[PDB]
Scaffold this active site. Structure first.
Site, PDB file in Angstrom:
ATOM      1  N   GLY A 251      -0.154   5.006  11.128  1.00  0.00           N
ATOM      2  CA  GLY A 251       1.390   5.254  11.072  1.00  0.00           C
ATOM      3  C   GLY A 251       2.373   4.259  11.479  1.00  0.00           C
ATOM      4  O   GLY A 251       3.681   4.275  11.621  1.00  0.00           O
TER       5      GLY A 251
ATOM      6  N   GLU B  92       0.599  -8.236   0.969  1.00  0.00           N
ATOM      7  CA  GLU B  92       0.438  -6.909   1.376  1.00  0.00           C
ATOM      8  C   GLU B  92       1.693  -6.070   1.577  1.00  0.00           C
ATOM      9  O   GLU B  92       1.650  -4.985   2.173  1.00  0.00           O
ATOM     10  CB  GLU B  92      -0.744  -6.623   2.033  1.00  0.00           C
ATOM     11  CG  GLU B  92      -2.147  -7.175   1.639  1.00  0.00           C
ATOM     12  CD  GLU B  92      -2.378  -6.782   0.303  1.00  0.00           C
ATOM     13  OE1 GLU B  92      -1.670  -5.572  -0.365  1.00  0.00           O
ATOM     14  OE2 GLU B  92      -3.441  -7.045  -0.399  1.00  0.00           O
TER      15      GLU B  92
ATOM     16  N   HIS C  94       0.918  -1.139  -0.038  1.00  0.00           N
ATOM     17  CA  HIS C  94       0.086  -0.119  -0.171  1.00  0.00           C
ATOM     18  C   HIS C  94       0.781   1.366  -0.047  1.00  0.00           C
ATOM     19  O   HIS C  94       0.384   2.470  -0.102  1.00  0.00           O
ATOM     20  CB  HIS C  94      -1.048   0.068   1.166  1.00  0.00           C
ATOM     21  CG  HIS C  94      -2.295  -0.759   0.871  1.00  0.00           C
ATOM     22  ND1 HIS C  94      -2.191  -2.101   0.543  1.00  0.00           N
ATOM     23  CD2 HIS C  94      -3.437  -0.205   0.376  1.00  0.00           C
ATOM     24  CE1 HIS C  94      -3.524  -2.459   0.161  1.00  0.00           C
ATOM     25  NE2 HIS C  94      -4.345  -1.367   0.204  1.00  0.00           N
TER      26      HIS C  94
ATOM     27  N   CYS D  81       2.338   1.344  10.018  1.00  0.00           N
ATOM     28  CA  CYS D  81       2.643   0.764   8.687  1.00  0.00           C
ATOM     29  C   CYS D  81       4.041   0.403   8.581  1.00  0.00           C
ATOM     30  O   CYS D  81       4.777   1.548   8.338  1.00  0.00           O
ATOM     31  CB  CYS D  81       1.781   1.443   7.876  1.00  0.00           C
ATOM     32  SG  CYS D  81       1.350   0.164   6.394  1.00  0.00           S
TER      33      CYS D  81
END
Ligand SMILES: Oc1cc(-c2ccccc2)nc2ccccc12
Length: 182
Positions: A147, A73, A42, A149
């Site tokens: 945040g 992901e 992402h 991530c």
């Protein structure tokens, strides 16, 4: 700690993590070996990204997929680095498991490098809206924020996952396996 499980995390941050900036924001990146860094998918990296504030050209880009062909992901980027990462592949487990008392190592969007105790971690099945080709992520009860991530899920001598998602109450990591890198 401080504390072997904090020292471990701090050294991992120091020697292997970076702040990856894209059009989508700031993410923690993890250098695994050679010039390969893992980042959440992402982050959606272009041909150029910023690594700790420095525009770097990404040579190759590889989305990771599990045994059933479901996207993890996380993506692996081949960078233009100096330079080579100390190979941390040996800390990455070979198979899925549940892990008691884990930490989360955070760099991006934080005042300074931070270790968070997320508690016990269990594998949890992805929820599917089509088919039954299963996939697991590592789940933990902790109010994680977007945040986080890119954050590294770990224990001493074990680099277990990359934080990629959450719902306010639980956090979820992409499950790292050594075969994704060998
Ligand atoms: O840990 C996370 C938590 C949340 C989140 C989602 C809804 C409410 C509160 C927090 N959103 C996230 C988005 C991207 C990456 C990680 C995330």
């Amino acid at each position: 700690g401080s504390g072997p499980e904090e020292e471990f995390g701090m050294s991992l941050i120091k020697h292997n993590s970076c702040v990856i900036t894209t059009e989508n924001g700031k993410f923690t990146g993890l250098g695994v070996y050679d010039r390969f860094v893992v980042v959440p998918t992402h982050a959606d990296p272009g041909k150029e990204i910023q690594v700790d504030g420095i525009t770097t050209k990404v040579i190759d880009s590889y989305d990771l997929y599990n045994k059933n062909g479901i996207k993890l992901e996380i993506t692996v980027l081949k960078l233009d680095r100096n330079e080579k990462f100390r190979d941390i592949r040996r800390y990455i487990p070979n198979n899925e498991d549940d892990y008691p008392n884990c930490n989360l190592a955070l760099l991006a969007n934080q005042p300074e490098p931070t270790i968070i105790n997320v508690g016990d971690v269990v594998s949890y099945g992805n929820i599917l809206l089509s088919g039954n080709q299963t996939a697991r992520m590592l789940k933990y009860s902790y109010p994680t924020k977007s945040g986080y991530c890119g954050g590294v899920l770990y224990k001493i001598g074990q680099v277990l996952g990359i934080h990629v998602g959450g719902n306010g109450r639980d956090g979820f990591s992409a499950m790292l396996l050594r075969s994704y890198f060998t």
